[PDB]
Amino acid sequence: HMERLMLEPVWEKQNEELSYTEHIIVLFETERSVTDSIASHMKDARVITLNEAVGHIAERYQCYMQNIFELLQSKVRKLSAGRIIIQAIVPLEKEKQLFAGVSGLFKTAEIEFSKLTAQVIEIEKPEEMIDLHLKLKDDSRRPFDKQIRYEAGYRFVKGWREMVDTLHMPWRDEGVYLITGGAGSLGLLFAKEIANRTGRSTIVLTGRSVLSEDKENELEALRSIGAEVVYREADVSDQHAVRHLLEEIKERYGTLNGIIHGAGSSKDRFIIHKTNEEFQEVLQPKVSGLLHVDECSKDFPLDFFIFFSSVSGCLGNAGQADYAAANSFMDAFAEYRRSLAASKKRFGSTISFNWPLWEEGGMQVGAEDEKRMLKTTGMVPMPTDSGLKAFYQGIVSDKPQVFVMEGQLQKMKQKLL
Ligand SMILES: NC(=O)C1=CN([C@@H]2O[C@H](COP(=O)(O)OP(=O)(O)OC[C@H]3O[C@@H](n4cnc5c(N)ncnc54)[C@H](OP(=O)(O)O)[C@@H]3O)[C@@H](O)[C@H]2O)C=CC1
């Protein structure tokens, strides 16, 4: 009576149909010209210009996310008082696409702040367009438009198109797979699965912690299947550690056949209480960590590079501003990596999965809240085979982003369409 519902993001034309105490617009390394024109034209809105950070793209994202984050915190008393609109202007460009991830943060902010409207607006070349102010003004008039795209005289909104035997699989019986966050509860599950499927496989599990006894004990059974498993105890935030890990991979082994990026963690707190330190700490593994991995494994002939993202990244979730923006960055990265592959610069197919709560994933366990989330969302703790099935189905479809939900269909579809 429960079924996986399974979704896939779409840019659609969808323009079928109160007043703001405040109007804020944030520009992500937009053109100087753009900045000035907008301020002049929109002097009834505050305009913030993020151009300021130095780092790789991930570094700049983490920085700007913190700036958005500190902005909300401050305006917190206002949000109580009255309505507000923030619009983020993201130019589609070489890497600036990734800032579109700020959408995870905006969705969480909306859940936590009743009277906030937050829109992310991606623009192919905003400076060149000087019709811009009316659109922003016009977009401000349709609050329910959360993600909006302007390119080629086109105005798109993001929404969810549904996706619809025994499953094909990506496994090479010999050859190397790593799972960052591999000693975590999901990385072990996928470890076993590889073990069952693989035959003579090599599985490199990595994380920060020294292994506890039970982990090694849990690990040892997988050694039983005849797969060879090595725990490399590295921090994905540390670019050099990642480098070594990949090289040892290279020196040690023929090649890499596959990567799951499963490193990360959520730390629940409302934006009002959260520290900068905690905020950065949950961004790190999924944002910088992911970049670092991607760039160190660039020269490998991969069959796949799959990110383990979350339903939080695309819906937001109360108390997970940081987890959602981290996860949204990964989603945005999936498309960005594919483009690179078309350039021929990167090898293998890239997918980001928006996972729901797993039945026996560690991290969270549903318990009493399970019920609200079923009542709030119609979602249930997702069983492991259902998950593995969705995992295999997601690969064959070959989309950069797959959103997976398990629960009662009509409730789910009703909330999301
Ligand atoms: N569990 C679930 O139901 C769901 C999971 N997901 C996502 O799937 C992935 C797996 O989740 P799950 O296994 O349940 O959660 P866990 O916390 O059990 O797994 C995360 C693992 O990542 C490791 N890790 C954390 N930070 C770093 C870092 N900086 N560098 C390297 N390793 C790191 C942790 O180990 P250590 O602390 O030793 O470094 C931990 O083992 C996560 O990214 C999660 O966000 C998404 C939706 C639902």
Curated annotation (Swiss-Prot):
Location in the cell: Cytoplasm
Lineage: superkingdom: Bacteria
Remarks, miscellaneous: The acyl carrier 2 domain binds glycine.
Functional summary from the UniProt entry: Involved in some intermediate steps for the synthesis of the antibiotic polyketide bacillaene which is involved in secondary metabolism.
Similarity comment: Belongs to the ATP-dependent AMP-binding enzyme family.
Protein name in UniProt: Polyketide synthase PksJ
Organism per entry: Bacillus subtilis (strain 168)
This protein's encoding gene: pksJ
Residues of the full protein shown: 2669 to 3092 of 5043
